[PDB]
Amino acid sequence: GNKLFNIAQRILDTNSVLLTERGDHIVWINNSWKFNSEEPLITKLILSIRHQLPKEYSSELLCPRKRKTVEANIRDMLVDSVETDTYPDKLPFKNGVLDLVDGMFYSGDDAKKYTCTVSTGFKFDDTKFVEDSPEMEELMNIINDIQPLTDENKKNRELYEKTLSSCLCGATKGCLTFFFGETATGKSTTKRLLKSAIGDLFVETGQTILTDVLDKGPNPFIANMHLKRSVFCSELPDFACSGSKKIRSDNIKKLTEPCVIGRPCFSNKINNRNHATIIIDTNYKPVFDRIDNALMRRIAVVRFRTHFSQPSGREAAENNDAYDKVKLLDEGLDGKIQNNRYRFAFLYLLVKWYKKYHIPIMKLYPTPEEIPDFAFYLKIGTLLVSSSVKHIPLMTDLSKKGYILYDNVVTLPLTTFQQKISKYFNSRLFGHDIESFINRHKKFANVSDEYLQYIFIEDISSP
Amino acid sequence: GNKLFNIAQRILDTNSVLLTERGDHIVWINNSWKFNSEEPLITKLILSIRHQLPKEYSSELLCPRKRKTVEANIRDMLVDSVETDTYPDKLPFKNGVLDLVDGMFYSGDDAKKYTCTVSTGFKFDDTKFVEDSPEMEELMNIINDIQPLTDENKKNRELYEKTLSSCLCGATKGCLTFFFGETATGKSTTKRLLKSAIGDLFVETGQTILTDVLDKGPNPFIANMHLKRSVFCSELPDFACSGSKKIRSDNIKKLTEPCVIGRPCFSNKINNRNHATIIIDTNYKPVFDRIDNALMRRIAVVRFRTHFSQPSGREAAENNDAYDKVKLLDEGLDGKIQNNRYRFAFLYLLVKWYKKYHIPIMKLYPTPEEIPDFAFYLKIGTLLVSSSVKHIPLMTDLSKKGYILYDNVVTLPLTTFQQKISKYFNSRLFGHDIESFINRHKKFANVSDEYLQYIFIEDISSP
Numbered sequence: 003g004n005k006l007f008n009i010a011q012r013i014l015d016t017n018s019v020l021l022t023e024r025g026d027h028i029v030w031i032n033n034s035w036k037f038n039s040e041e042p043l044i045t046k047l048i049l050s051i052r053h054q055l056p057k058e059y060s061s062e063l064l065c066p067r068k069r070k071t072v073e074a075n076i077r078d079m080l081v082d083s084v085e086t087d088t089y090p091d092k093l094p095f096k097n098g099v100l101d102l103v104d105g106m107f108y109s110g111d112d113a114k115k116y117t118c119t120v121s122t123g124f125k126f127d128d129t130k131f132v133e134d135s136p137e138m139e140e141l142m143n144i145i146n147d148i149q150p151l152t153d154e155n156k157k158n159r160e161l162y163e164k165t166l167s168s169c170l171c172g173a174t175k176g177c178l179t180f181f182f183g184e185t186a187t188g189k190s191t192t193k194r195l196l197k198s199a200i201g202d203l204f205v206e207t208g209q210t211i212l213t214d215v216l217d218k219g220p221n222p223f224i225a226n227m228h229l230k231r232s233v234f235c236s237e238l239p240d241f242a243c244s245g246s247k248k249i250r251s252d253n254i255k256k257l258t259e260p261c262v263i264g265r266p267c268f269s270n271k272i273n274n275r276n277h278a279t280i281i282i283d284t285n286y287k288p289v290f291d292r293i294d295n296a297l298m299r300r301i302a303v304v305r306f307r308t309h310f311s312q313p314s315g316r317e318a319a320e321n322n323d324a325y326d327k328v329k330l331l332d333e334g335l336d337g338k339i340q341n342n343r344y345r346f347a348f349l350y351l352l353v354k355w356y357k358k359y360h361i362p363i364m365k366l367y368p369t370p371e372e373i374p375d376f377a378f379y380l381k382i383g384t385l386l387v388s389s390s391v392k393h394i395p396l397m398t399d400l401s402k403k404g405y406i407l408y409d410n411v412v413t414l415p416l417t418t419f420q421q422k423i424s425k426y427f428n429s430r431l432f433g434h435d436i437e438s439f440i441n442r443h444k445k446f447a448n449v450s451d452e453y454l455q456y457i458f459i460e461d462i463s464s465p
Numbered sequence: 466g467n468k469l470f471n472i473a474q475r476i477l478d479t480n481s482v483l484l485t486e487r488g489d490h491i492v493w494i495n496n497s498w499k500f501n502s503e504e505p506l507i508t509k510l511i512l513s514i515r516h517q518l519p520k521e522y523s524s525e526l527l528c529p530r531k532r533k534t535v536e537a538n539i540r541d542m543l544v545d546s547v548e549t550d551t552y553p554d555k556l557p558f559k560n561g562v563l564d565l566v567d568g569m570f571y572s573g574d575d576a577k578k579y580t581c582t583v584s585t586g587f588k589f590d591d592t593k594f595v596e597d598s599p600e601m602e603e604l605m606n607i608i609n610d611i612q613p614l615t616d617e618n619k620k621n622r623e624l625y626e627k628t629l630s631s632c633l634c635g636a637t638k639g640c641l642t643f644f645f646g647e648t649a650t651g652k653s654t655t656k657r658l659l660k661s662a663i664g665d666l667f668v669e670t671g672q673t674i675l676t677d678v679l680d681k682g683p684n685p686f687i688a689n690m691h692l693k694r695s696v697f698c699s700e701l702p703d704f705a706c707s708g709s710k711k712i713r714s715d716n717i718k719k720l721t722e723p724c725v726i727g728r729p730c731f732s733n734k735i736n737n738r739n740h741a742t743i744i745i746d747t748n749y750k751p752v753f754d755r756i757d758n759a760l761m762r763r764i765a766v767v768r769f770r771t772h773f774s775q776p777s778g779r780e781a782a783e784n785n786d787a788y789d790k791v792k793l794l795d796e797g798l799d800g801k802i803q804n805n806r807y808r809f810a811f812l813y814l815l816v817k818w819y820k821k822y823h824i825p826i827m828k829l830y831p832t833p834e835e836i837p838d839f840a841f842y843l844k845i846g847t848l849l850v851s852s853s854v855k856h857i858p859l860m861t862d863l864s865k866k867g868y869i870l871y872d873n874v875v876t877l878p879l880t881t882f883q884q885k886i887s888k889y890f891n892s893r894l895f896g897h898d899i900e901s902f903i904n905r906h907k908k909f910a911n912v913s914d915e916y917l918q919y920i921f922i923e924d925i926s927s928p
């Protein structure tokens with residue numbers, strides 16, 4: 003017997019309550035998986051689901067005490083945990099799940115299988131998710147004005163589209179992108195459009211995650227990034243002025259891993275799942291404490307070169323090398339965006355771009371040619387090679403050059419290498435990094451008399 | 466006769482609820498010892514073990530109030546504590562225990578004897594724990610790519626295999642291992658493979674456990690590594706920048722200890738059992754504040770020297786001496802590893818290596834010669850010998866060599882020692898270390914004090 007135990011068993015047989023690996027219960031209400039840390043929603047689920055039970059059972063669930071008894075039975079019933087958020091190509095809305103590969107929208111038992119514990123926070127509309135509309139035409143004009151379709155902007159616009167499209171995938175991304183451009187160029191407009199499109203999957207944090215350490219004490223700025231599809235940081239503190247802390251390369255490397263280590267206040271959970279595209283919006287180039295290949299593998303840059311100005315400053319801005327086009331500023335555009343006018347138009351654009359750029363594998367690739375800091379470390383790699391075994395027999399002309407054969411390897415001493423490099427670089431501006439490279443790759447081959455085991459490709463190229 | 470007291474006694478007779486020396490109740494549900502400080506599982510167990518009881522006793526357990534009464538009876542019954550996690554060669558799975566010495570898998574009462582309060586978190590498949598498989602061929606190819614089977618890499622690969630297989634032991638490990646290499650060499654791939662293989666017996670922490678003081682206040686980052694069999698802190702912040710604290714030698718010595726002192730938020734337990742093997746993957750060699758013989762006994766290094774590159778960067782990779790072999794990157798490997806494809810193939814490989822390298826006592830040995838910092842102190846020991854009475858009958862020819870005598874002890878003056886060491890050292894970089902050596906071994910003799918009672922091996926051999 004025990005009517006209430008029978009009710010709890012019947013409710014548990016529908017798989018509407020689940021226990022997660024973080025020790026919180028997720029309930030299936032209103033075509034969505036919901037959970038709350040301080041107020042569980044099990045009684046909410048019971049009261050909502052009373053309509054699916056026999057008449058003799060439904061009238062019992064109208065009493066809070068009996069609902070609490072059923073909740074206790076269910077809590078005792080749930081023993082084992084389940085894994086959630088395992089499908090990267092599904093976009094969850096408050097009333098269903100959108101398939102990014104097919105385009106089909108699922109609700110009910112079809113959307114139940116994909117245990118997505120996050121959502122955009124608003125309902126999906128099949129009527130406004132169309133390709134042709136005045137909203138779509140306005141949005142296409144705005145996008146084409148922000149990033150023109152000229153041949154000199156093709157790769158940059160493709161990178162723009164790829165970065166914006168990746169904000170739909172629930173997986174780990176391997177690059178950090180920089181939206182760089184001068185004032186009034188559409189960067190914050192793009193950010194607000196994306197926020198309107200993807201809703202609660204979009205989060206904004208501070209420069210602390212880039213500048214300070216991440217373990218330290220409690221860090222809600224890192225703890226809030228759990229399972230978010232897009233993270234935005236803004237207003238990079240230009241480091242030309244003194245007192246500014248440089249960006250940490252280890253922070254960049256840790257923000258790429260699939261698990262980020264950090265904890266909130268009054269909590270012991272120290273591991274967060276990383277599903278986010280991290281975008282930094284700035285008008286100044288970034289500088290890092292140290293530069294290496296690992297850092298150079300994880301940075302991409304998108305440029306904004308269109309200025310929207312009043313007629314007062316049109317002539318002044320038309321004589322600036324920082325802009326490739328000047329347009330007329332729109333006054334009501336920010337309010338129109340705030341009213342979620344282009345939400346579904348931009349969603350349709352994002353899904354189309356996702357299909358376009360998502361061949362069987364979609365990956366983010368770096369652009370190290372856009373950062374002035376990497377210039378020396380790129381030119382050095384273009385001018386020198388490491389002395390391998392395959393250069394031993396040719397040591398005659400190399401000894402004419404100045405190379406010496408020690409320990410059966412060809413090497414180059416201090417001063418000769420210094421002047422050979424100074425012939426290729428500038429001593430006034432490229433000094434500190436030259437000394438840093440010399441100290442980094444220095445090797446004392448014998449007792450004193452240090453040397454580098456590096457050969458210029460020009461010496462072998464031109465005998 | 467108090468049916469509920471009889472039920473509580475009958476449940477206690479089956480030995481399914483135990484009290485631990487940490488003051489927590491562990492229950493045996495679904496072939497596993499489980500506990501949760503926030504939500505006790507005693508009522509879950511009471512509901513679970515109800516078909517074993519007689520028919521009249523079973524029906525009484527369908528009420529939460531009666532289950533709570535039985536739980537109160539059990540809590541009053543349990544007075545004495547027991548010891549858990551004692552067997553080091555048993556691997557606990559969610560549905561049993563794998564015997565590492567024999568390979569047998571025990572389920573039920575056979576696995577109940579080993580009070581293993583930790584688990585991998587997933588069930589054990591006997592169909593996938595096989596030698597032949599497409600997954601096994603793919604995994605063998607991947608591992609052979611990451612660590613080549615050449616004789617120039619034989620010892621390094623053996624160290625690799627030993628360190629990985631030591632993650633299955635439930636004992637304490639007295640060595641810290643560094644995974645050192647350049648970018649795109651397979652360190653994170655190895656970390657992800659091990660994480661998928663051993664599941665929940667794996668925690669990733671921050672760099673505070675290496676850089677800061679462990680005691681301080683609360684420290685979840687060190688209270689979370691209790692009975693974990695692998696700790697995988699990552700991305701040291703290239704201490705050569707000098708903008709951050711170096712590694713702490715006392716922190717290393719405390720981490721190679723059977724118990725670690727550290728307290729989480731709330732709670733009152735400050736000692737944590739150390740079953741973990743700590744691995745750190747970095748692009749830079751470690752540097753420590755103080756170097757001594759106690760530190761050199763607890764550090765080993767595995768080096769990664771295979772590059773996985775794009776075709777556009779293949780040539781620049783082939784021209785680098787930091788790599789020994791360049792191969793083509795695979796796009797889908799990250800997703801395949803994330804999908805737990807090689808979960809049991811790697812487990813079989815690890816058990817095979819465990820049986821291989823577990824000569825009845827398995828220990829982790831250090832590799833000091835792999836650390837550039839230890840070079841000075843290492844080859845000082847091959848040059849200098851502490852003075853002893855057996856070197857007394859050489860004073861005449863030693864004075865011809867320049868050695869002085871003081872109270873029947875051979876001694877060399879400060880300037881003489883400096884100028885004789887100058888034959889074996891340079892000045893620019895070794896000055897700090899030579900001053901450190903002189904001041905640390907500065908005894909009292911000759912001119913009042915400040916003389917060194919050491920003898921060079923060269924002058925020992927030469928009469």
Ligand SMILES: Nc1ncnc2c1ncn2[C@@H]1O[C@H](COP(=O)(O)OP(=O)(O)NP(=O)(O)O)[C@@H](O)[C@H]1O
Nearest residue numbers: 144147184185186187188189190191310330331332
């Ligand atoms: N396509 C467009 N056509 C006309 N006006 C536009 C268009 N896009 C944006 N605007 C307007 O131009 C303004 C430019 O501001 P904003 O979008 O913030 O550029 P910004 O790069 O963020 N400036 P800043 O952040 O200081 O570097 C917007 O606030 C709009 O009012």
Ligand SMILES: Nc1ncnc2c1ncn2[C@@H]1O[C@H](COP(=O)(O)OP(=O)(O)NP(=O)(O)O)[C@@H](O)[C@H]1O
Nearest residue numbers: 296607610648649650651652653654773794795798
């Ligand atoms: N055997 C393999 N064959 C082909 N590709 C591989 C293989 N093993 C790993 N890869 C891929 O090659 C890349 C190497 O990355 P990763 O494993 O992170 O090396 P890494 O040393 O951690 N890079 P870094 O952290 O910057 O030093 C990844 O995209 C892997 O998926």
Ligand SMILES: [Mg+2]
Nearest residue numbers: 189190191283
């Ligand atoms: Mg802005």
Ligand SMILES: [Mg+2]
Nearest residue numbers: 652653654746
């Ligand atoms: Mg890595």
